[PDB]
Design a protein around this ligand. Structure first.
Ligand SMILES: Nc1ccn([C@@H]2O[C@H](CO)[C@@H](O)[C@H](F)[C@H]2O)c(=O)n1
Ligand SMILES: Nc1ccn([C@@H]2O[C@H](CO)[C@@H](O)[C@H](F)[C@H]2O)c(=O)n1
Lengths: 809, 809
C-alpha cells in the first residue's frame, strides 16, 4: 500500500501464509472454524517471531567470536508497549504481512489491537530505557538490557464516578510469545545472614537463597539484521525451601513475591523492604551473568570489556556488589577492585526533586545486606579522606558529601554512592545537567569536575514516527527518501519545502486524517462525541503537582467563563484532552483527576457552549494509547514549573508528529525551541532565575488572587461548589493548597499562560501559517532521535564506536 | 530393532529428522553447538507432539458431529508418569524415532530419562485413573478426564541418615510440552456468601469468586487414531481481586493456592479447609463445562448424553452441585432434578478403612458452601422418609443410614451421600464388593440391592508390558502375534508353550537381562552393589501398617539370624528390595522406613553373610521407577492383612511381567490365584473369616511371642538396640505397637509366612520349574487388563458400547 512499509513479494507472501496456517494448526491446535481473532493474532505473532530467530542466534554467535566490549544497561523499568508492529517495521515485513493476512481474509490492524502492552514501567524513565534498547541495536552495539520480569506491570486505570480505580495488569494471562524462558541459566541470590571474619577475609554466611530465572526477549535493530537481548529475571524458591508440609509449600510464595509487581510511583521514593529486595535481586543476578560471560572470553581488562550503565540510583547496589565479588570472592585487594569498579560503572540522574531521591535506612541494609553495609562504610571513609585532603578544615563539606546521612534515623544517600563509584555522571538535558553542577551536586563537581556530563534525551523515530504515523513518514519519504529513518538529521532537508504548496496541503491532510481516525476511536471504544474540526489541545503524562495539570484546568475554566460572559462572540473551538495515571497513594493527584472529570461534566453539557469547548479525560494512558493520540494532536502542553522536569520525552514525540508546543523554558523544551527557533514555539512564564527570585522574596499566592479578577472568579467557583453541587466542599483541599501551600507556583504563571494561549488560537485561525510553523518544527526535530543520544553515550562514556553496517541476513 | 516397536520407513525417518532440527532452531532457539541433552529431549517431544494434533482435532470434531453419549471421569488424582514413550508406542512411532535420533548421533533412551513424571497422584487410586484414560481412548469411548493441575505433585523422597525427607516436586520448572493452556475457556467458581430466599426460589449471593483456567492434555488410544482429552483446572484470581495497592496484588496468592499442591495422604482423611476448596473447585468448573457442552448439542435427555463417574468420594459434591444448578438456575422442580442426577451419577469405592472415609464437619460446609448444606439436608430428609417407609419402626437403621452423623461435632458422611445420589455403586474386586454389601453398606444394599456392582480393577498392557518390558512383549509376539496388546485374553495361547524348551529359555533370558539392566541402574544412579544371580524379592507400594512392610522386615531378620546360626549351610541368595513413600505426618510409617534402612546397615555389612542376603530401600518410588523394577522382579510381595486391601494393582503389574506372587487371600489376589490356579501361587495366612474369628476372641500378640522362639529373638534384638547401637530405644514405639496395639495382626501370620517363603526358595533352586510356573502366570493374566474393566463399566454402568475400529489417519 505505502512505500516505507516495504515490499510484498509473491514468494514472501506465499511463505507467510503457509507458516500462519502451520502455527494455527500445530502451535495453537485450532481449525479455522473455531479460531477467534485472538487465535489469529497469536498465529501471526508466531509467524513473525520465526523470522527473528536466525538473526538472534547469529548476532549472539558473532559477539562470541569478535568479543567486542559489552554494554550492560541496568534498569528496574522497561516500558516496551506492544511488540508485533515494531518487529515487522524493523524487519521490513509490514506490507508482506498486510498482504498475506488480507488474502486469508483478515484485517491486520484489528489483530494488532489484541496484543497486551508490556507495561513494565511508570512513564518517562521506563520508556527511555525502551527507546535506548532500540537505538543500541540499530547502531550495532553489543548491548544487553537487564531488569525484572514483573508478573504485574503498571495497573490498568478505570474511571468510576470521576475517580481513578486501579486494576491488576495481568499481562501474561494469555502467554507472551516474545519471550524465551531460560531455566538452564538460573542463578542464586542471597539475602539476610551475617558476616564472619576469617584469616582469609570476610565471609557472608547463614543466608536465605532465592533463585533468579532469566527470560530473554529479542530486540531487533532497524533493517540491519542485528538482534540484541533484553534479559529479565523472575524469582523462584529453591526446592528444599522451608523444607507442616502443606504450609512449607504454600510459603514458597514469600520468595517469589520479589518479582510479582512493579512499584507504581513516578518520581517519588518509598522506603519499603520489598522494593529493596527487588533492587538487589536484579543487581546480584545480573553481575554473576556479566562475570560469567567475561571469564568465557585477570580483572585489569574488566573495564575494557564491560560497561555498566545505572539508570537512576535504583540499581546503585551494583557498586558495592561488584566490590564484594572482587574482594571477597576473587581476592583482589581493595584499591585494585575500586579502580576496576569506578572504570566500569556510570550513572544517569533523572530528577532533582528531593522526594524522589533514594535514601535507605541503615537498619534495613543492616538486616538485609550486612556485608554491603560494611562495604559502603569503607567506601565512605576513603572518599571522605579524599575530600578532607582537597579542602582541609572544611567540616561542613564533609557532612554534606558523606554517603551516610545523620539524624533521627541514619540513611544512605544512594546518589552520593553512585557519584563516588562511577567514572561518569550525566543529566538528561542541558539545563538539568547545569543545575546538577550548580546546586544538588555542586560539592562533587568541585572535587571531580571531569566526571560530569550532559546527554540530552531522545526518542526512537521507528516507534514514534514510522510505526504510529505512517501517513507522515510516507509524505516525507516521497520528497527526501527513506534514509532519515535512521539518520533523523536529514529532516532538515524539509526546510526547502516550507513554501511548497503541495507539501503544505499534504502535511495538513495527514493531520486531519489522524484526527478523524482518533475521533472515531473515541466513539467506538468510549462512546464519546468530539468535533474533528476543533484544535486538539493535549496534555498526556503522569499526574503530578510539578507537571501542573492544574494550570491547564485553570485555563479551561477561564475559556468556559469567557464564553458564558459573551456567548455570541466567536472563539476558536477546542477539544482539551488530559490523561495520565496517578500513583495509588498520592491523594492530591487523585483529586486533580476528579477535578478534570468534574469540569467536563459541567462544560460538556452546557447548551450555550455547544461544540465550541469539550474537556475529555483520556482513560488508561499507556504506550499503545500514546501511539494513537500523539499523531492526532495540534497543541502539546509542556508546562512544568521551570527547573522541575529534568528533560521530558513526550515533548519530543509531539514535535516529530506535527503538533506545536506551548511550554515553559524547562528541561528539553529549551533545546527544542533553540533548534526550531523561538518564533516557532509558544514559550511563556518564569525562567529558572525568576523562580529563584520569587523563592528568595517568598511566594504569596494571595497577591495574584487579589490582582486578577478572572482568577478570583475561578477560585470562588471551586470553593462554593459550582463544579460539585452535591458536595460543595469537595475541592477544598485543592483550593487550600493553591492559596497557602503551592510548591509549584501555579498562580505566578497564570496571566502569561492565558495570554500565550490567545496567541495559539490566533495562529490556528490561519491554517496555512499554522502548517508552515509545523513544518519548521518537524524539520528541526532531528537532534531528538535516541540514535544521536546513544552515539554520544557510546563515544563519550562507554568508549565504543557505533556501526551502521548490516550483518548478513 | 524389535518388531512390536513398529516400522522405521525411510520417508518417516527423514521427516522426523528435519522436524527435530526445525524445533531445535525455531522452538528452542538453540544451535547444535550449545544444545544440551535437555534441549534434545524437548526437540523430540515437540516432534512427537506434532503427530498428535491432527488426530486430536479430528477426534473432537467427530464427537461434535456424531454427538455420542459422553463419559466424564472426575478425579482429584491422575498419576500419569512420563508421556514421551507412551505417545510413541500408541502412535507406532518408536522404531522410527529410535532410528532418526540414532542418525542424529543421539541415544533416545538417554533423552527419555530427562522427562519429569507427572506425579499428580499418591498411589493406586491415582494410577487407576491413568490406566482408565488409556483404555477408554483405546476402546473408542467419548471420554474426558477432569481434575486439578497441581503446581506441585507428590513430593520427591530423599533418604537422609535412614530417615525420609520431603522435597517439593517442581515438575513444571522446565515447562510441560504436552499441555495446551486454554485461557479462553476460563470459568468462575463461587465460595462463601449466604443464601437469600426470594419469590422465585433460593439465591446464593455475596460470594467470593475464583477463576478456573483449563489446561488440556491429549490421551492417545493404541493405534486407532483416537485422541481424547484430560482437562485439568488451574486457580486464578479475578483482576479486581481485593481491588494498600501492593498488598492487594500480593494477596492474589490466597485464591491461587487452591491448585498449588497435592495432599500427600494415601488411604487417610484430613479435614482441612483447603482440601474442601480443591474438591469443590474441580466439581463446579467441570459441571459448567459439561452443561455447556450438552446445550451445544430440555434436561430429560441429560442422562442419555452424560455419564459422570465419581472416583471415590473426593468429587461427591457433584451431586448437590448438579441439584443446585438444575433447581436454582434452570428452575426444574426437585423431583425431576433428582431423577436426572441419580441417572447421571455413579460412584466407585476404593477402601473399607474407617480412617480413609470422608466425613466433613457441618460448620465447614456452613461457612464455605451454605447452599450445598441446605441441599444435602433436603436430600437426607427425603432419603430417610424412604427408609422409614421400607422398614417401619426401625429407628436405629435411620440413625445408621443418615447422611448426617450426630455427636460432639456434626459431620456429613460423603459415602452415604454418594450411594443415595448414584444409580450404581461399585467395589474394585470381588471380595471387596462382597464386603461392602455384607458390612459397611449392608443397610443400603438391603434398601436398593440393584445399585451394587463389582468392577475388578485392571492395568493397561501398553504401559505395563510393551513400554516397560519390550523384550517380553517381543518373545510373546514371535509366537502369537501382536493382537494380544489390545486383547490381553489372547495370552492364554501361551499355555501351549509351557513345555516348549525354546520358550522356557527365552522367558528366563528376558528376566536375566531385565535384572542385569536394573542391577546396573542401581550402581550408576545410587552407587550400590547387588548380585544379579540372587532372587529379586520386591515389595513396592505406599508405606502403611495395613500393607505390613513390617511382616517382610520380620522375615528378613529371621533369614539373617538363621545364617548367623549356621553360617556354612547353603541358602538361596536373595536381594530384598522395599520401596514406597510415607505420608509426611504419619509417624509409624516414617519409623518403618528407618527400620528397613537400619536392618540394611547391619545385614549388608556383615562379612559372614557375604552376598547371600542384601536389603535395599528403593528411594523415591514413583511411576518411572516402577517401570524399571517391576520387569526385574522374581517375587512380588502382596501381604496385606486379609480384608484390608480393596484390590491392589501393583499385584497385577508383577504377574504380567514374570514374577511369582507371595500373598494373602486379599483384594484381587483371590481372583489372580483363581485365574492361574492355586498351585501356581504362594498363598498363606489368615482368610477374612479367620481374622473375624480372632477379633471376636480378642487378639493377644503375647501368645505368639511366648510360643515362637525365633519371633521372641527378633523382638529382643529390636528392644535391646541390636539394630540401633547408639540409640538403644529407637524402635520402642514399633515394639510397643506390635506387642499391645496391632490392628493388623502381624504376629498371627508370621509362622505361615516364613514357611511359605521356604517353599519359594525351594522352587527357585529348580530354574526350569520356576520358569514353567511363571509362564502359567503370564498366560492367565489377561483378565487384569483395564480394557476388560472399562468394557464392563461401559456396558453395565454407562450404557455405551466399546469400539475397536480406527478413525481415519
Ligand atoms: N523516577 C523517575 C525519575 C525521573 N523520571 C523522568 O525521567 C525521564 C527520562 O530521563 C525524563 O525525561 C523526565 F524529565 C523525568 O521526570 C521518571 O519518569 N521517573
Ligand atoms: N485414598 C485411596 C483409597 C484407596 N486406594 C487404593 O485404590 C486402588 C484403586 O482402586 C486399589 O487397588 C487399592 F486397593 C486401594 O488401597 C488409594 O490408593 N487411595
Amino acid at each position: 500500500q505505502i512505500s516505507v512499509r516495504g515490499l510484498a513479494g509473491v514468494e514472501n507472501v506465499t511463505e507467510l501464509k503457509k507458516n500462519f496456517n502451520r502455527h494455527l494448526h500445530f502451535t495453537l491446535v485450532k481449525d479455522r472454524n473455531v479460531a477467534t481473532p485472538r487465535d489469529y493474532y497469536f498465529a501471526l505473532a508466531h509467524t513473525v517471531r520465526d523470522h527473528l530467530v536466525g538473526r538472534w542466534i547469529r548476532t549472539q554467535q558473532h559477539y562470541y567470536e569478535k568479543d567486542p566490549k559489552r554494554i550492560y544497561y541496568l534498569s528496574l523499568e522497561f516500558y516496551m508497549g506492544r511488540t508485533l508492529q515494531n518487529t515487522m517495521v524493523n524487519l521490513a515485513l509490514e506490507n508482506a504481512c498486510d498482504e498475506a493476512t488480507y488474502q486469508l481474509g483478515l484485517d491486520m490492524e484489528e489483530l494488532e489491537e489484541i496484543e497486551e502492552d508490556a507495561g513494565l514501567g511508570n512513564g518517562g524513565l521506563g520508556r527511555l530505557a525502551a527507546c535506548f534498547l532500540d537505538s543500541m541495536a540499530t547502531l550495532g552495539l553489543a548491548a544487553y538490557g537487564y531488569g525484572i520480569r514483573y508478573e504485574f506491570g503498571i495497573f490498568n486505570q478505570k474511571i468510576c464516578g470521576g475517580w481513578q480505580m486501579e486494576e491488576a495488569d495481568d499481562w501474561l494471562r494469555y502467554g507472551n510469545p516474545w519471550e524465551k524462558a531460560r531455566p538452564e541459566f538460573t542463578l542464586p541470590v542471597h539475602f539476610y545472614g551475617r558476616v564472619e571474619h576469617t584469616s582469609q577475609g570476610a565471609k557472608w554466611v547463614d543466608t536465605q537463597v532465592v533463585l533468579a530465572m532469566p527470560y530473554d526477549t529479542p530486540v531487533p535493530g532497524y533493517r540491519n539484521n542485528v538482534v540484541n537481548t533484553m534479559r529479565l529475571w523472575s524469582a523462584k524458591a529453591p526446592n528444599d525451601f522451608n523444607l507442616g508440609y502443606i504450609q512449607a509449600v504454600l510459603d514458597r510464595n514469600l520468595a517469589e513475591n520479589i518479582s510479582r509487581v512493579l512499584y507504581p510511583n513516578d518520581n517519588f521514593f518509598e522506603g519499603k523492604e520489598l522494593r529493596l529486595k527487588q533492587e538487589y535481586f536484579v543487581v546480584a543476578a545480573t553481575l554473576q551473568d556479566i562475570i560469567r560471560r567475561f571469564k568465557s572470553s585477570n580483572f585489569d581488562a574488566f573495564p575494557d570489556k564491560v560497561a555498566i550503565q545505572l539508570n537512576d540510583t535504583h540499581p546503585s547496589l551494583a557498586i558495592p556488589e561488584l566490590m564484594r565479588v572482587l574482594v571477597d570472592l576473587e581476592r583482589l585487594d581493595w584499591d585494585k577492585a575500586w579502580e576496576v569498579t569506578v572504570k566500569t560503572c556510570a550513572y544517569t540522574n533523572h530528577t532533582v526533586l528531593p522526594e524522589a531521591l533514594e535514601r535507605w535506612p541503615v537498619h534495613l541494609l543492616e538486616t538485609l545486606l550486612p556485608r554491603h553495609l560494611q562495604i559502603i562504610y569503607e567506601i565512605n571513609q576513603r572518599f571522605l579522606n579524599r575530600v578532607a585532603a582537597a579542602f582541609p578544615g572544611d567540616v561542613d563539606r564533609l557532612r554534606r558529601m558523606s554517603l551516610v546521612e545523620e539524624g533521627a534515623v541514619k540513611r544512605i544517600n544512594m546518589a552520593h554512592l553512585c557519584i563516588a563509584g562511577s567514572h561518569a555522571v550525566n543529566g538528561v538535558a542541558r539545563i538539568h545537567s547545569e543545575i546538577l553542577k550548580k546546586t544538588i551536586f555542586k560539592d562533587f563537581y568541585e572535587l571531580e569536575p571531569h566526571k560530569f556530563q550532559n546527554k540530552t534525551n531522545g526518542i526512537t523515530p521507528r516507534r514514534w514516527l514510522v510505526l504510529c504515523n505512517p501517513g507522515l513518514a510516507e509524505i516525507i519519504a516521497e520528497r527526501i527518501g527513506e534514509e532519515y529513518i535512521s539518520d533523523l538529521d536529514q529532516l532538515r532537508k524539509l526546510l526547502s519545502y516550507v513554501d511548497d504548496e503541495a507539501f503544505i496541503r499534504d502535511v495538513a491532510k495527514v493531520k486531519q486524517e489522524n484526527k478523524l481516525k482518533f475521533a472515531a476511536y473515541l466513539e467506538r471504544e468510549y462512546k464519546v462525541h468530539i468535533n474533528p474540526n476543533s484544535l486538539f489541545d493535549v496534555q498526556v503524562k503522569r499526574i503530578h503537582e510539578y507537571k501542573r495539570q492544574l494550570l491547564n484546568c485553570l485555563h479551561v475554566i477561564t475559556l468556559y467563563n469567557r464564553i458564558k460572559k459573551e456567548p455570541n462572540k466567536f472563539v476558536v473551538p477546542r477539544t482539551v484532552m488530559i490523561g495520565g495515571k496517578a500513583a495509588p497513594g498520592y491523594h492530591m493527584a487523585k483529586m486533580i483527576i476528579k477535578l478534570i472529570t468534574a469540569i467536563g461534566d459541567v462544560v460538556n453539557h452546557d447548551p450555550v457552549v455547544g461544540d465550541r469547548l469539550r474537556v475529555i479525560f483520556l482513560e488508561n494512558y499507556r504506550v499503545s494509547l500514546a501511539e494513537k493520540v500523539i499523531p492526532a494532536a495540534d497543541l502539546s502542553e509542556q508546562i512544568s514549573t521551570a527547573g522541575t522536569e529534568a528533560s521530558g520525552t513526550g515533548n519530543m514525540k509531539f514535535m516529530l508528529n506535527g503538533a506545536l508546543t506551548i511550554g515553559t523554558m524547562d528541561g528539553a523544551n529549551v533545546e527544542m525551541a533553540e533548534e526550531a527557533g523561538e518564533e516557532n514555539f509558544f514559550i511563556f512564564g518564569m525562567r529558572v532565575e525568576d523562580v529563584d527570585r520569587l523563592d528568595q522574596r517568598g511566594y504569596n499566592a494571595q497577591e495574584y488572587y487579589d490582582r486578577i479578577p478572572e482568577l478570583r472568579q475561578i477560585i470562588e467557583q471551586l470553593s462554593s461548589g459550582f463544579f460539585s453541587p452535591k458536595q460543595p466542599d469537595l475541592f477544598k483541599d485543592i483550593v487550600n493548597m493553591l492559596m497557602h501551600h503551592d510548591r509549584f507556583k501555579v498562580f505566578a504563571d497564570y496571566e502569561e499562560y492565558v495570554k500565550c494561549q490567545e496567541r495559539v488560537s490566533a495562529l490556528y485561525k490561519n491554517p496555512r501559517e499554522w502548517t508552515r510553523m509545523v513544518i519548521r518544527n518537524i524539520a528541526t526535530s532531528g537532534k531528538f532521535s535516541s540514535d544521536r543520544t546513544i552515539a554520544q553515550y557510546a563515544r563519550e562514556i562507554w568508549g565504543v564506536e557505533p556501526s551502521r553496517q548490516r550483518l548478513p541476513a
